[PDB]
Design a protein around this ligand. Structure first.
Ligand SMILES: Nc1ncnc2c1ncn2[C@@H]1O[C@H](COP(=O)(O)OP(=O)(O)OP(=O)(O)O)[C@@H](O)[C@H]1O
Lengths: 490, 108
């Protein structure tokens, strides 16, 4: 609706006035409108609807690739004969003529495809002052448009082209099967919509046909009356079709796959501090940027905690920048990926961004010392940039080399630090043991006795504890394994 | 000139028309990308356009199934890989051990 209001208010307003006023002042009507967006958004639908809605002349629909044919120039120039003659006969009173050229970038690339541009540009501007012609250019790839047309006075206005609509189109498709009492009541259309997040109409038709195909198979290796589409076919057919999108919200859910244990109260304290900071960002209108540092010994567990806080926040926008995503890229690609990831966080009222293992992104190795200065400078600049007006960010970055960051003098960029010490008391070990149901009560009572007489100060990370428990579960369930292994990892 | 029989039978017998199947060996030979360029004879482009016109703007020909066998999908023009035109794609990979035994039995 917002685009529908903008295009109407701004572009299509001059024609409303009495023609003599326009003729006298000399105000010029906008000529070009460029509708762009991903495939399947219905750009053709909008182009068709615009003409009928505005009571314009019957649109002349021409395919981009079909333009390929001096006869191409003849066709291009012939296209304008009707409008030219109509304006000649009347002038300002000529009705609005609309021409839509589907897949403009197919033929209008930077020599038929050159002579076509020559003809179009010769006819469009200069000797001609035809304000009664509106050309709509639609393309899935905006970068491919010729630079000869991307200039003021030509295609001045650019327009960029949901859950409920998806459900409605599902209903449209299903009407025929649902009406004829061949659909089981177990099938929940809203459930399928929740499953289909990044699918377009043609994909929906494909899923419908494949799901029906499984019902077809069920019969064929005269009871045709029992041909019914079941939910199982819909669930099974999902493996055939595939979308062409991507999401990182899943990445923020796998980082906590191991779950929490609350083995100590300081975990609760840290979570409380995080929920305090998130609320502070939510409520204050002045604090538009908050930076937090989470540091501690290696292996203590820092990514999981930040991910948990972020998932508890409940903001509309959440994302993670991890080294895994950057692997295999060149430097000039990493610097642009990091910039884009930041530029996409300024388009929502509230945002959370998590950065993982800062020192690993910078390629730090202490022998040289060697590291990449460009990425470091980029991050340093980004971490202090205020977001645009009325938008708020919360950035959490995790690191394990506090001293190195101290050396680089980057420490001034953060507002607060949070330390996460690894467990050291055998009480925490008891809690973890009961949580992991490793052994019965007797073994879990004997393990502490065996440890207390060999290793009073524990000082072991939780990750190592979990992996040690997992590996000890197999060889010898009794204590005679664990106490040794852990003593080896002390 | 290949589709004339199917059109005639369709027009003659409505939905009673039998199934006509034509298979295009070495599909990637002619139907390469239609934006190759070269500034020469265009007979290598109108061919794709003709096939696409008779396959998309079929005028309701719903009794035709085209099968295309190739070794390099990447070279095929992308315009023909979309719903309504070569929808289903089946990959044939190397056999498994049991399939190997089956092949050995068949050969011997
Ligand atoms: N506070 C915590 N409470 C309970 N379990 C935790 C906690 N922090 C981490 N874990 C567990 O530790 C596992 C791995 O820890 P994690 O990957 O966060 O370690 P890390 O110290 O960030 O790693 P790295 O050594 O790569 O810097 C997670 O699967 C999670 O279950």
């Amino acid at each position: 609706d917002k685009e529908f209001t903008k295009i109407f208010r701004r572009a299509f307003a001059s024609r409303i006035f009495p023609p003599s006023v326009i003729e006298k002042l000399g105000i010029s009507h906008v000529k070009g409108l460029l509708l762009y967006g991903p495939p399947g958004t219905g750009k053709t639908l909008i182009a068709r609807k615009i003409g009928t809605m505005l009571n314009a002349k019957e649109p002349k629909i021409v395919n981009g690739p079909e333009i390929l044919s001096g006869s191409s120039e003849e066709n291009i120039r012939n296209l304008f004969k009707d409008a030219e003659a109509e304006y000649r006969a009347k002038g300002e009173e000529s009705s609005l003529h609309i021409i839509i050229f589907d897949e403009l970038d197919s033929v209008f690339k930077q020599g038929v495809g050159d002579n076509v541009v020559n003809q179009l540009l010769a006819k469009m501007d200069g000797v001609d002052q035809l304000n009664n012609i509106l050309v709509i250019g639609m393309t899935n790839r905006k970068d491919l448009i010729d630079s000869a047309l991307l200039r003021p006075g030509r295609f001045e206005v650019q327009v960029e082209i949901d859950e409920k609509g998806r459900l409605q189109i599902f209903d449209i498709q299903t009407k025929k099967m649902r009406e004829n009492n061949m659909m089981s009541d177990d099938v929940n259309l809203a459930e399928l919509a929740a499953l289909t997040k990044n699918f377009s109409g043609a994909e929906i038709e494909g899923l419908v046909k494949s799901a029906s195909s499984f019902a077809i198979n069920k019969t064929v290796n005269k009871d045709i009356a029992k041909l019914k589409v079941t939910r199982e076919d819909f669930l099974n057919a999902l493996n055939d079709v595939t979308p062409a999108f991507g999401i990182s919200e899943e990445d923020l859910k796998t980082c906590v796959e191991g779950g929490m244990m609350l083995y100590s109260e300081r975990v609760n304290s840290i979570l409380k501090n995080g929920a305090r900071y998130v609320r502070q960002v939510r409520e204050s209108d002045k604090s538009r940027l908050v930076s937090l540092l989470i540091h501690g010994p290696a292996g203590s567990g820092k990514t999981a905690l930040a991910a948990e806080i972020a998932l508890k926040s409940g903001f509309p926008f959440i994302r993670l920048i991890s080294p895994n995503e950057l692997s295999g890229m060149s430097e000039s690609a990493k610097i642009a990926y990091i910039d884009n990831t930041f530029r996409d966080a300024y388009k929502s009222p509230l945002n959370i961004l998590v950065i993982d293992s800062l020192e690993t992104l910078v390629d730090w190795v202490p022998i040289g010392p060697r590291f990449s200065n460009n990425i470091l400078q980029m991050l340093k600049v980004a971490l202090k940039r205020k977001p645009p007006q009325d938008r708020r960010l919360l950035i959490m970055t995790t690191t394990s080399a506090y001293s190195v960051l101290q050396q680089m003098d980057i420490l001034s960029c953060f507002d607060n630090e949070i330390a996460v010490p690894n467990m050291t008391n055998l009480d925490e070990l008891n809690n973890v043991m009961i949580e992991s149901n490793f052994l019965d009560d007797a073994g879990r009572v004997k393990v502490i006795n065996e440890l207390s007489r060999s290793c009073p100060n524990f000082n072991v990370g939780i990750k190592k504890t979990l992996t040690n428990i997992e590996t000890a579960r197999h060889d010898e369930d009794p204590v005679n394994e664990l106490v040794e292994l852990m003593t080896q990892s002390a | 000139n290949l589709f004339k029989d199917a059109e005639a039978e369709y027009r003659a017998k409505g939905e009673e028309s039998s199934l006509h199947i034509i298979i295009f060996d070495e599909l990637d030979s002619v139907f390469k990308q239609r934006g190759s360029r070269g500034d020469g004879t265009g007979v290598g482009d109108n061919v794709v356009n003709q096939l696409l016109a008779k396959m998309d703007g079929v005028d309701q020909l719903n009794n035709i199934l085209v099968i295309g066998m190739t070794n390099r999908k990447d070279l095929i023009d992308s315009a023909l890989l979309r719903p309504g035109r070569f929808e289903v794609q089946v990959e044939i990979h190397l056999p498994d051990e049991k399939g190997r035994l089956q092949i050995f039995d068949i050969q011997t």
